[PDB]
């Protein structure tokens, strides 16, 4: 069931069936995907990133651990991704605003999660739109997972380089996340301060579905809201 690829094993686990590696893949997914967005939308300079490959034919730019400021951001995502281990992370989103830091956003890259009770078949709750569809999505093996990753990244690159208009010369981008209902009230992610507001969207804004992720015991759905569309 595992993946037969050395290039893939450089970034992601070859196995994604058991609960721990399913969570591990999501951790790496968050890191890889959101790194690509930060570069492709030019929110950080090229220096923060290092060149990596998902497959031999596909390259991506991942936050380099040798840059101290990029390493700090990489740990934001690592910490966020860790909340997927125990099913406490509902949504993590890259939120772009005019001023730091408004509730209403300009551009949002959202990754929403769904967890599974046992065996990776039944949705868990953990919650209370695409929730319905994403819950019905079934694990189809690691090869399906690799395709999902490749698809998402090709789509992010394409969306940012050939669909979206370049961001304004002045903005502020930060990561905003939402905890699940299962999460303890004492539960906070290191680097993410409390807040009474998440993010809001202007009524006329346009959304496009970037892709999905379905490992053994997790499910992710990634979208994009931007005036740049």
């Amino acid at each position: 069931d595992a993946i037969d690829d050395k290039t893939w094993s450089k970034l992601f686990p070859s196995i994604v069936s058991d609960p721990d590696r399913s969570s591990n893949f999501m951790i790496r997914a968050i890191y890889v995907v959101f790194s690509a967005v930060l570069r492709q939308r030019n929110i950080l300079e090229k220096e923060y990133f290092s060149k990596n490959y998902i497959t031999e034919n596909l390259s991506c730019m991942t936050l380099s651990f040798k840059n101290l400021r990029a390493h700090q951001i990489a740990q934001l995502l690592r910490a966020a991704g860790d909340a997927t281990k125990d099913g406490f992370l509902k949504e993590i989103s890259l939120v772009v605003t005019e001023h730091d830091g408004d509730v209403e956003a300009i551009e949002v890259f959202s990754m929403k999660f769904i967890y599974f009770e046992n065996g990776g078949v039944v949705a868990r709750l953990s919650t209370d739109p695409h929730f319905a569809e994403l819950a019905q999505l079934r694990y189809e093996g690691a090869e399906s997972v690799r395709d999902q990753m490749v698809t998402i990244v090709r789509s992010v690159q394409f969306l940012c380089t050939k669909v979206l208009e370049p961001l304004p010369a002045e903005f502020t981008a930060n990561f905003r996340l939402k905890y699940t209902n299962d999460a303890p009230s004492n539960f906070r992610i290191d680097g993410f301060d409390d807040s009474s507001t998440f993010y809001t969207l202007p009524d006329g804004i346009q959304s496009v579905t970037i892709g999905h992720l379905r490992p053994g015991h997790h499910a992710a759905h990634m979208q994009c809201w931007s005036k740049s569309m």
């Binding site: 730091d100 930060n174 990561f175 996340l177 939402k178 301060d193 009474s196």
Partner: peptide, 17 residues
């Protein structure tokens, strides 16, 4: 300590021009 909301915000990344 109890948490008021299910939200968490990170440090921003700004650009001025």
């Amino acid at each position: 300590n109890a948490r008021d909301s299910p939200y968490g915000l990170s440090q921003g990344i700004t650009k001025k021009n």
